[PDB]
Amino acid sequence: STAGKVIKCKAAVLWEEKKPFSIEEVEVAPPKAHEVRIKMVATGICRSDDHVVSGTLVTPLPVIAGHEAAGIVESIGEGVTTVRPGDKVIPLFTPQCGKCRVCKHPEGNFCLKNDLSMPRGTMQDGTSRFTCRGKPIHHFLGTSTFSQYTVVDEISVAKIDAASPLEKVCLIGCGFSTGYGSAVKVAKVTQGSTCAVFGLGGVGLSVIMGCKAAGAARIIGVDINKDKFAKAKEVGATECVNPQDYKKPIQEVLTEMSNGGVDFSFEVIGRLDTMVTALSCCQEAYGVSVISGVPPDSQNLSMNPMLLLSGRTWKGAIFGGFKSKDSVPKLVADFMAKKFALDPLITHVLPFEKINEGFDLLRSGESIRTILTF
């Protein structure tokens, strides 16, 4: 009874930069070829969504943001073979087309069909499925999850376990997978190793989780906010250090604590200075440092290339380095098998309509993660 027809529903539209989200009645067009319309069940509030508001992550406005989410398929357009009406799904802000240079590469995941490098804010076909009072509203990262219903291209959605709790697994759409993959996929943390995680928010916690699943012997949480330590240890951190406690630079403290440098360091914060600090605190000959947060408005950092000449490896990634469509279902499966817990990351749950409160919570730093429910 909705298939093939425009659906009228509510969405959170951002009409202009630096403005609160406006809950509006919007029209969601039915899926065209290879597209999938999804009824949203839950969506997380991610810092990246806030960068849009800030005009820091440039993408065309007005837009429906939101990229970390889970829902149920309402209908599919022609030619769609990977999901069916009724399936539980997670939108993939990093698509997996399967055919570009990158998707075919054993090590690449940044699919060239992405709307991140040069944001267009549309469907793959250059159009939008969203209107508010006749006016076109843009899409965001091919997902647009801050709406009761969205339409995404098939390469930007993955089918997940029919028994999954969507209020929890939605985190796999961004925050968790980013942190988790940084450790298990990008760094390739090894058993018995020593790890240093800079930034103990939601993503840093997921890094710890990855280091633990990988069997790290030591995981040193680093953060200037000691209130983050309890939860960090709770998910696997062996120790926690607050750089503000020390009279010496933190790379020194970490090098000395790890008897010469750690095996693996992670910067999840996106700070120029900590990214360099994190690089230096890894062992000079075989240490690996992984970054996962870089604000779209980043200036250039300044570092000494001698940090690299000795043997260090520096790398970054998007979405934890996971090929999205392949990985998302496996991660949910892992969750369903009770291999890792997501609850520690969820500190707040609010009905969708209270989105702006959820953003206040994000900006204040009070929450690790707010989940919005429909």
Ligand X SMILES: NC(=O)c1ccc[n+]([C@@H]2O[C@H](COP(=O)([O-])OP(=O)(O)OC[C@H]3O[C@@H](n4cnc5c(N)ncnc54)[C@H](O)[C@@H]3O)[C@@H](O)[C@H]2O)c1
Q: Does 296 bind ligand X (CB under 6 A)?
A: no
Q: Does 111 bind Zn ion (CB under 5 A)?
A: yes
Breaks (C–N over 2.5 Å) after residues, the chain: none
Q: Does 100 bind Zn ion (CB under 5 A)?
A: yes
Out of 140, 266, 314, 322, the only residue in the binding site for its own copies (CB under 8 A) is 314
SS3 252: helix
What's the min distance (Å) between Cβ of 51 and its own copies? 13
Please give the positions annotated as active site: 46, 48, 51, 67, 174
What's the min distance (Å) between Cβ of 184 and ligand X? 17
Q: Which is nearer to ligand X, 41 or 203 (CB)?
A: 203
- Separation of alpha carbons 183 and 278, rounded Å: 14
- Contacting residues for 337 by C-beta, under 8 A, at least 6 apart: none
SS3 141: coil
- Separation of alpha carbons 191 and 216, rounded Å: 5
- Kind plus residue range of the DSSP H or E element containing 106: none
236 backbone dihedrals φ, ψ, rounded to 5°: 135, -15
Task: Give strand ranges (E) for 133-193.
Answer: 135-137, 149-153, 157-159
202 binds, among ligand X, Zn ion, its own copies, none (CB under 5 to 8 A by kind): ligand X
Out of 9, 40, 48, 320, the only residue in the binding site for Zn ion (CB under 5 A) is 48
Partners of residue 219 on adjacent β-strands: 195
97 binds, among Zn ion, ligand X, its own copies, none (CB under 5 to 8 A by kind): Zn ion
Structure tokens at 191: 């058993």
Q: Does 294 bind Zn ion (CB under 5 A)?
A: no
Out of 23, 29, 72, 102, the only residue in the binding site for its own copies (CB under 8 A) is 102
- With CB under 6 A as the contact rule, which of the stretches 57-65, 77-85, 263-271, 279-287 interacts with ligand X? 263-271
What's the min distance (Å) between Cβ of 173 and Zn ion? 8
C-alpha distances out from residue 271 to 276, 292, 332, Å: 9, 11, 30
Q: Does 298 bind ligand X (CB under 6 A)?
A: no
Out of 225, 298, 304, 310, the only residue in the binding site for ligand X (CB under 6 A) is 225
Partners of residue 152 on adjacent β-strands: 36
Q: Does 288 bind Zn ion (CB under 5 A)?
A: no
Q: Does 260 bind its own copies (CB under 8 A)?
A: yes
Out of 26, 318, 332, 355, the only residue in the binding site for its own copies (CB under 8 A) is 318
Parallel, antiparallel, or unpaired for β 264-267 and 194-198? parallel
Parallel, antiparallel, or unpaired for β 370-373 and 35-44? antiparallel
Structure tokens at 101: 């240079």
Q: Point out which residues bind its own copies (CB under 8 A).
A: 101-102, 105, 107-110, 112, 117, 260, 272, 275, 283-286, 291-294, 296, 298-306, 308-318, 321
Positions touching ligand X (CB under 6 A) are: 47, 198-204, 222-225, 228, 243, 268-269, 271, 274, 293, 365
